Structure formats: C-alpha cells, structure tokens
Design a binder for these strands. Structure first.
Lengths: 252, 54, 97
RNA sequence: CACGGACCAAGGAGUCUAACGUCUAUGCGAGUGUUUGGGUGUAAAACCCAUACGCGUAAUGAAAGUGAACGUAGGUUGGGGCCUCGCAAGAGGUGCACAAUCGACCGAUCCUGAUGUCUUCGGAUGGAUUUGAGUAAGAGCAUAGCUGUUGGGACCCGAAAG
RNA sequence: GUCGAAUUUGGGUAUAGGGGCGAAAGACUAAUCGAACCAUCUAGUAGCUGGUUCCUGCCGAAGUUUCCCUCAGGAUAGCAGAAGCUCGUAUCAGUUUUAUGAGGUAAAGCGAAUGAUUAGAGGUUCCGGGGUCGAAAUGACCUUGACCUAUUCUCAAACUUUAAAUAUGUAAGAAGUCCUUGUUACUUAAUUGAACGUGGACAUUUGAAUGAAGAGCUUUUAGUGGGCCAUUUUUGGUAAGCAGAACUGGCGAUGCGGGAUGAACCGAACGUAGAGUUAAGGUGCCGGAAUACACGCUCAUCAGACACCACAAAAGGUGUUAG
RNA sequence: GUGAUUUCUGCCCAGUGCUCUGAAUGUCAAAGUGAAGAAAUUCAACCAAGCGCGGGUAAACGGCGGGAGUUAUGACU
RNA sequence: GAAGACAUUGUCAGGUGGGGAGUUUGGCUGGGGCGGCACAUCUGUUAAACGAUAACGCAGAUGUCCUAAGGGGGGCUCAUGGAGAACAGAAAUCUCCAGUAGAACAAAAGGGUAAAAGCCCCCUUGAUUUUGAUUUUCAGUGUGAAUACAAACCAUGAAAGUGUGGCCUAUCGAUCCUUUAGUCCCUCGGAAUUUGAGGCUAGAGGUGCCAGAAAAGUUACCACAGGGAUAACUGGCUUGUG
RNA sequence: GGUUGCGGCCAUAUCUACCAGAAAGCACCGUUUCCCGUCCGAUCAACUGUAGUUAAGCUGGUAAGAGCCUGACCGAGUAGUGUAGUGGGUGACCAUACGCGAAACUCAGGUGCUGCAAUCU
C-alpha cells in the first residue's frame, strides 16, 4: 500500500507503435521523476506515484503529446483519527489507431471533416489524430473528444505491408508540401520475376520515389478485409494499391 | 465452489451395477461387409434346417 | 485468398452421376422480396397503436461475410453448393499463386 | 446482546375452474360418448331418442402424393403355465406376456429403368454403413378420484412507481 | 433586526399538477412537494421479508454435476417416497485370494545427461528489434542492445536411469469345453478360414474364499442445489478461529453416558418396562464406588494434578536422584 | 451576462457554437422525366433546404505550453 | 386602400429538434471501483504413482499461416568437433574421419521421428461424393476437433500399400432473415402459359459476454424491498538486544 | 559343424584393441556396346566369372578394458508407508502393536540364442 496513486497506460493493439513513441519521449523531457517503481503489463506499463499531485501532473503532460482518455476511482484503508485521504488510480488509454494504418472511416464522421473519402491512411499521429487521403491529398483531423464517443478499429496493421518495386514515376504536378499525386507505375516483388502484371496508382510518394526502388504498400486485392464500414463502400471505387513508405537500405 | 465431498456416498446408495451383457449383441457398429454376408448366412441355414432335417 | 473460376465437381442429376465442369461467381443481393412471410404483420400491424413493430440489430461487434463459390455447371445448370471457411475478403480468378 | 410476542375471546391462509400427464375404480369394447336439441313428467329431478359431430380402428412427406402377409404374420436364444413319461429326481412336447437379435412389408431420400410410349411420358423388377412419433390377429372411448403442471387475484399480507 | 418605506395588512379578483408561482431556498401550492389531494384500472408486479390451524404409524434427504446477463434464482442429473409389475436362486458384492495388466509420487541417484538463480566490466558496417525525422539515402539522431567474447561453485514443483506403500483394470466357465460336418452373395490358390448352427459326448466339487431380510425391471413425483468441523496428504499467505483442494468419518437432521460447562472429541445411536453385566470415565468429601495394595521420585517466599483444551522459549541452578 | 463609485479590462477565430449581400456541382427524399421490359418492376440522368468548402465574431463557451540556441533574464532569435 | 394566382390552408417528403416523452447503462471479484479475463479454448505445473479434482495459483500460447509447409514415391543424413586446401581470416567453397540426434520438423509447451515424420528431387489434388457408427468435454444433448470402416470415382508406386487436409495435442458458432449453387423437382388451392414468389437437401452472412439482449451518465434532494456490522484472543499469540 | 538367402527376440548380439580363417559360399576386383544415372561407370545400371585376391568386408578368438544382462542369509528387513491408541514430547518430531517392503551400491557369474530353405572335406 506504499504506492498510494497510480497511472495505468494501455493500448489494445498488438504492435504498439504510438506507445513506444511515448516511452522515448518521456525519457527525453525526464517526466518520470516521482516514480516509485515501474511495473510492466500485458498491454502497457504501470507507474506508481507516491503523492496524488505528481500523478495528476503526468496526465497534464500526457495530454500534450498523445491522444488519451482517463478516469479515476478510490480505495479505503485506515483514517488517522484530525478530521479526515483516499488511495486513487488513474487509468489512461491511448487511442489505438497507429501512425501508418489503413482506416475506413464512418460515413457521418467523414462527411463533417472536409468531406474526405472514407478510405484514407493515417498521417502524423500527434496530440490529435490526422488522416490523409493518399490519392488526392487532403488532410483531416480527429480529436479524442470526437473519437471516443463512437470508437472504431484500424483496418490493417503494419504486418500486412507488401514489398513492391517501382517501375517509373510520373508527376502530375499538384502538391501542397509532399510533391503530391505522382502517378506511380509499380509491380509486385513476386511477379516482377516471372509475370507481367503491372499496377498503376497515384500516391503521395512523389519526391522521395524513384525508378528501381522498393516501396511497401497495402494490397487490397488478395488480402482479407472484413469491416462493415468497408462493406458499405462502392467496391469499384476502391483503389487496388495504397503505397505507404520506402525501405531505402542506407548502409551495411 | 467445487468439492467432491459426499459424492461417493450418494452413488453407493443404489450401487454400481453392470450393463448385464445380453446374448446376441447388436450388430450396429459391426463392419458392414460382414453384416451383409451374415444376413444371407442365417437365411440359408434356416431353410436347410426346414426341409432336410424334420 | 483465391479459388478458381472453373471446377470439375460431382453431379447428382438423374443423368450425370459423375464429376462435370462448373463455374464460379460471388454473393450478390437483389431485392429481398417481401412476399417473404415476415413483412406483412409488419405491413399489417406496424401501422398501429403499437406502432413501429419489428426490432433491428445494433450490438455490432459482427465481423464476417458470406463468401460464395458457386458451381455453375456448363453441362446441366442447376443448384447444390460447395463451402468455404471463415474468410474476410473474397476475390476470384486472378492471383493464381 | 439476531427479528416478532403485555394478557383473553372471536375472525384468520394450497381454493375454484378451462385444458391436460402418470396411476387407480366402474361401464361398454372396434367401438365409445343419452342431456346443442326433441319426446314425456308427480316439473330446474327422473325417463326415452333420431341425425350428425368428437376421439379411436393407418402411417408418412415441405408438398403433388403414394399407403402395410415370400411364410402354420417368419428364424434363433430365455420364458410362467399345461400335456406326456417316471415312484420320484429329472427327461421330452407346446410354449402366452415380456427381454435381446437377424430378417420381411408401407412412407421419405439416394439408386436400378422392364413390357410399353401422344418421344416423353409411363415405373415393372432389383437395391442401399440411410431416415419415420409405423404394420407385423386391433384397445380405445366416457365418467369419477388423489397426486402434479400451465393460464387465471391463484397459499394469505406487503412496495418505491405508471 | 428594521421601524415612513422595494413598508404592513382586510376584502374583492386572476393563474391549477409536468401545471401554477418564485428579489431563486428545489422554496411554496390547505400540518402533504426533486411533481398536490380524491376515486377508479388494482386483490398493480416482486428471483425479497413474515405467517401458514388435528393426532399416531412407517420410510427418509440435500448444499454437487453441466447450462442460463447466472451467483439471494431457475432447468437438467443425482439423493428420496409411493404405486407396483415379470419371476422366485436369480447371479450380483464399498471384501479377500490366486493369475496377470497399467502408473512414475515417497525413497534412492548427482564422480548416469539436463539445471537455474543474485549481480555485469568493455566490444560503432560480427545487427537494425525498434523511435522521431527527413523532395532521400553516403542517413542523420536514438534505445533494448545485436555479441558473453577466456570465469567458477551450489540444485529444482515446470531434471532423470531404478522404483515401494495405499488406491486401480481384467479373468476364476452351461451363453462353457471337445468331437463329427451343415449354411453364405464375405474371405482363401483351395470349402481353407470366419460367423452362426444341426447331431453326439461332458453333471453336481461344473472349475477360488465368504456373504446374500429375495433378484430383475418400469412409471411417476416431493424436497434440496448458501454447508461447516476433525485427523492425515497439501497449494497461497511471515503467520491467522486465514484463502482454496484431496480420501474417510461426523455435526447439520441426534438424543443418552464421559470431558465442571461446550453443535464437531470419547463411548454409544432412542418403542414402553423389570432384573443382569459392561463401555468411555472414575472410586478423600461434595458424589454412587478401595483414605486398597506395591516399588520409587518430588518441597516450590506464585508447587502439581490427565488427550482434543484454554499455556508457554532458549539458557542457567554443589537443590536432589539415578547413570 | 457582470454587480456602486475610482481605476483598468491583455494575446488567440484552430476547437465547439453562432453567423454571412460569399464560390458553386461533392452529397442529395417524395413527386416528375428518360431508357429496357408482355406488365409488376429495374436502371439512369435530373435534383430544394441542410451538410461540406470559403469569410466574420471572445463584456459567446472557453484557452494562455514546451524544446532550443548566449546562466540570472518581462532580453533578442 | 393594400396585395395577388404568389401568400394562407390541406396532404405527403427531406432537414433541424433534451424544449418534451419511453427505456437501458453486463458478469466474475479477500467490500465495490480501476486493472485483469481465471467468460470460448490449448501445453507444463499446482495434483498427493488410474481417472477426476479448486483458487484474481505459476511459467506461457490461439481469433492465424500454407497449391505446398497437403498426398504419394525415390535418393540421401543432421547440430557440432577434429585434421587438410591460392587470396581465405573468428565465419565463404572443397575434402575426410569421428558423430544416438546435442539439428530440423510454419508457431507455445510437452510428447514423437535416422535407408524418417528431417533434407533435396519426381508426379500430382483424397484439402473430392453419399450419408451413418464411434471417442473427447457430457445430462453420455449441442458445437468444435478426432478415430475406424462401407459405397463411388481417382492420385502415386514396378509392388504391398498409403491418402477423407497440416506428425499428435489448440486455431472456432443455433432459431429468424438473407443469398447462391442439385433435382429443372413440388405449390401459388376455378383452369392454363410466361415472369415473379414460396418450398425440400447440402453450405457460407455470426453474435469474442463465444448454448448466441437492440443500451451513456449522475444524484450530498433521494425513495422501496431485503441483507451485512462494532472494533480489543490465531495454537497460547504480546517484551531487550539489525 | 562352416558359409548363403529370408527372418523372430532386439547389446549376453554394442564399443575399443590386436590375432587367426583348409574347404565351399559371400566379398574386393575386371570391363563400358546395349538399358540407365551422374559434374565424375565412385554409388546406381548393364556385361563377364574371364585377368587377379584374403589386404579389407564378414566369421571366430583374446583383453585383470568400457558397457550390458542375469543372481545374491550384499546393501537391508534399512529407507519409505497402510492401519491403531485418552502413547511420549512445549514443540520440532520420536518410540511401540498389526502389516507391506525398496533403490543405488557391493560381490559372484555371463558375453548371443534360435526358425525355414539350400549348399559344402
């Protein structure tokens, strides 16, 4: 009973990307000073804070860098008999939508945020969650006050990315800050050797993409998606390839 | 929660009897190639004990 | 995943009694036909002191999809299916592996 | 040191009915049930009665439909009782109910496709690790009784609410 | 407190229940207000408390299994009563013996393999698991480190060659054994096998011991589905009148004799009575019964007196006794 | 909404509200129109307000941090 | 005077709408809440030598992956250690001896495997059709998973055989409604034809609270029906010496 | 009795070291046209039993060897355990009554047995 107050951090996703971002940022600003100990969990880690006010001061730090939700309870011990003083617990939950997911948004939710299409990627994850349309570049933000009233899931994790090989890049010529809408022509790693089946897709990977270069991407065709929000889409409007990022083997 | 106390004393009030092992056990579950022959084997030997020995 | 569009499977059809060649498509909904028997105590007894009768579904942790591999025989053309698994997308034809 | 009880008389709580399950009694028995109604009466009693209808004598199928004996209504293993034999013990013959098992028949499903045939109908015969709440010298119907179930205020007294 | 004014008051008159009225307290609206009073639908519903009326006879439980938004409750299975039915030595048994099976805990084993633990000192293309970045990839910044690099000794519920006890499966025959040859569409090169039989032989020691207030079978329904205690084997907890299990007995449902007293310990389980002997316990007196016998020990300025049980530790003491 | 007077009332229109003499073809009900069909029907364009994009507003709800770079700083960046 | 085929009014349709009405706001639990899944399952242990056997006991896994990592057949032997070979070394390729598995078998853990169940090649779809019987959890119901056959057609091998999915133990789902595939079968009940609709038989929409409700808060203004108390004794517990 | 073919039980049959094997049989060895398979006629295929061999293989014998397997008034009636008491002890735990009964170790002895067919101084 020496702990006397606790912050409980959890993220439900099996590959915790934003949560590993939290542990390196907390070491940088040295926010963990008043810790009694650190105990791991199945889904995250626990912080045991001796005085109440130090536990609250972490949550003011947690609001600035990561989208959270929190609530508190209490427990009863032994009441020094000066008129009086309960043992508290703070349960902080990170938004599970990672930095580089694929997301099918709800229709009513997507209609408000700039009338973006339902089939977008994740962008930046900051304090607020940012979504980017990969085909025609347009950004939209989701705050935790809007997310937690109607929660949903990501459509694919990091472990569904597929190695591709870029054939050539054609720049259409419209951009904000990302050399946007390069009409990339790209083919699979498995089918470049023995086949000619070539995929043809716009992407945000404009300036950082070159010919003879390996990119990772979400592949909607063979892979098995199961979302009800995805099911109420128009299947002949969904792009086949969503180009995500690049490997770029730097040095040996 | 769970305990097995008094559970042996309940079952040994009416005892533990055997399933009493009848003559002519049922051929359901015996091999069907054998059952198809053994249908005809009893048929001839009931005819043969009808006319010959009487 | 992937399945073929063409499939040599069994026929039970008073003439074939053998395996003939069959054709594959997917699962499509055309109008649910409320000559179906449960939609005119709806269009009877909805319209009432009693009001909107039939309940809906909401507890939507539901996930999967009906994935149809049909066997359209090129020889006789009638109707008894084949099965798949708990599966999430289904395209057919391309990406032979 | 949990709750109710100061004392006395009176009142005071598993009832009734509709439909039913097992068991038991009685009538009649491949039938059974007079009483919705009519006839008569000493008059809400008793007595007498036609035509139907109910349940039963036939199942099975989602249905159109078809619809139960190769035979001393079958073979084997036990089976009370009676018959024969023996002074008896026992041996031998017939063996009801009922228990086990292999068959046969009818309906369903899958198969076999005869004489024929408006050339597409018709379904003879033969099958099968299948399936039925069946046939295989009928047993049900009606009234009453205790026990039990369901719907009723339902063993009596009790809310905060609408 | 205020007391010539936003003062005090009579009568008239207006606003009515999800409505009114409020210099705002959720106040007031006929002793009723976080939604008035009256009658009716209403004997509203209740897995929750309380109560439930005559006697005697016989039999006699359960707090456990699976399933339920299920844990104060129900269905189902078990336990129990009743009505009985076909027969009457039936073949069964909370048991032993013989003949064989199975097991891997106690003990043994570590100079017969495995085997932790506590702490960790440096190794920039011997990795890269990851983080943010970046109009790129000769690309930076970071962290657990990729690596134990040449260390030792010690064990274990998730180590083993060998392997008790106690519990446990099966057999000890009439539906069985042998001789002779019938059936078939299966099986074999083959009427050879297989399976089932006809006919013949084998008899009360007919195939170990002991017992059998008959054995076999079916319908139908009540209550119960909050359990606790003890010895022994144990897990969690320093340790609990603590938390959870295992086999058997008991209390609950059960008095009587003994432990002064006591739900669980010891003896023993109940028709009404008489005589007889005993159990556990006791025999100075209360208090029925030997101030019986026999060998010793012990003196306390808080002696000691009978299992469960209501008391105690190490270590000291020329106090005493026997070694 | 604040609560006499005196004296002051800073910065922010991203968020949520509110608002508009603002661009228009993204969304888009019934009726209507067109096409195919033997007909019931099916499909297609068309499409109001509102939503969406754009502008205004804090005596509207409200907010007023961190990292650096030379070490105390109402410093500059 | 003003206004005019617009306004108003009637009917249907879309938007807005806590101002108002109705209702819900899981369970287990060393009090409830938070965390967690002990709620559906699997391996080792707890577990005391059949089986069974509890705890919010312990160390861990599953909501997948695979036309080969399934089926058959043939050839071959692995981790590692030792001795030798231009560059070549702590680790490239080649060679030989020793080599009971110290390797590998998609993954947790425990079993299993040496002319194989490993490794490298060869041909293939039995990962098929009809439905019964059995084992596990168990009421001897369901569901999942599995075992041994029967009737068909096949694959491989010279052959015996083997194969009804992953070497064994886990990897998954009812009624209702939906939709597709076999007879082109049955019916639309006055009689026909064609669309349409309803049926039988086998399967996929799925409830993860997993034998399967459509569901956010607060009450210190609170109400009702009930249930729990209260402290001062573990087994003798408490004292002066890390 | 010695070999060969096919085996059963699967170390008393293995492992390490040396030593012997008349006979017949297995084996090493000879060759590359055909069938076939490789980088390589070494394995595998075919052809010859002709040119040559017991050097190996295999078989047998030995070693105060390692191992394994049977035996023990060996360890030891010890450890452990079923049942019993108003038995002991503050406890830890230990005695006694009726029962069951190990193991490593120590020592002694052992080193394949055998079924069918055939061929051999």
């Amino acid at each position: 009973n020496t702990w006397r107050a606790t912050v409980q951090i959890r993220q439900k996703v099996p590959h915790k990307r934003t949560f590993l971002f939290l542990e390196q940022l907390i070491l940088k600003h040295n926010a963990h000073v008043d810790t009694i100990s650190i105990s791991e969990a199945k889904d995250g880690l626990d912080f045991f804070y001796a005085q109440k006010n130090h536990a609250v001061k972490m949550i003011d730090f947690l609001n600035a860098v990561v989208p959270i939700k929190h609530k508190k309870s209490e427990e009863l011990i032994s009441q020094d008999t000066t008129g009086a003083t309960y043992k508290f617990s703070y349960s902080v939950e990170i938004v599970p939508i990672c930095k580089d997911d694929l997301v099918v948004l709800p229709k009513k939710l997507a209609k408000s945020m700039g009338n973006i299409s339902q089939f977008v990627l994740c962008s930046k994850i900051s304090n607020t969650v940012q979504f980017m349309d990969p085909t025609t570049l347009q950004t939209a933000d989701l705050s935790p006050s809007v997310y937690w009233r109607a929660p949903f899931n990501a459509l694919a994790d990091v472990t569904q990315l597929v190695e591709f090989i870029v054939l050539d890049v054609d720049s259409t010529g419209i951009s904000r800050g990302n050399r946007v809408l390069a009409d990339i022509t790209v083919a699979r790693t498995s089918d470049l050797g023995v086949n000619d089946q070539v995929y043809y897709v716009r992407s945000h990977l404009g300036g950082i993409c070159h010919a003879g270069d390996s990119v990772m991407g979400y592949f909607i065709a063979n892979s098995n998606y199961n979302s009800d929000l995805f099911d109420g889409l128009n299947i002949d409007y969904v792009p086949d390839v969503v180009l995500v990022k690049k490997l770029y083997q730097r040095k040996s | 929660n769970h305990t097995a106390h008094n559970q042996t004393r309940k079952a040994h009030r009416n005892g533990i009897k055997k399933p009493k092992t009848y003559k002519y056990p049922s051929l359901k579950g015996v091999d069907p190639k054998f059952r198809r022959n053994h249908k005809h084997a009893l048929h001839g030997t009931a005819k043969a004990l009808a006319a010959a020995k009487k | 995943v992937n399945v073929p569009k063409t499939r040599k499977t069994y026929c039970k059809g008073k003439t074939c009694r053998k395996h003939t060649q069959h054709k594959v498509t997917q699962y499509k909904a055309g109008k649910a036909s409320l000559f179906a028997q449960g939609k005119r105590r709806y269009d009877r007894k909805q319209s009432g002191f009693g009001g909107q009768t039939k309940p809906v579904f909401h507890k939507k942790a539901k996930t999967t999809k009906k994935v149809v591999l049909r066997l359209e025989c090129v020889k006789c053309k009638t109707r008894a299916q084949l099965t798949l698994k708990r599966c999430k997308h289904f395209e057919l034809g391309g990406e032979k592996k």
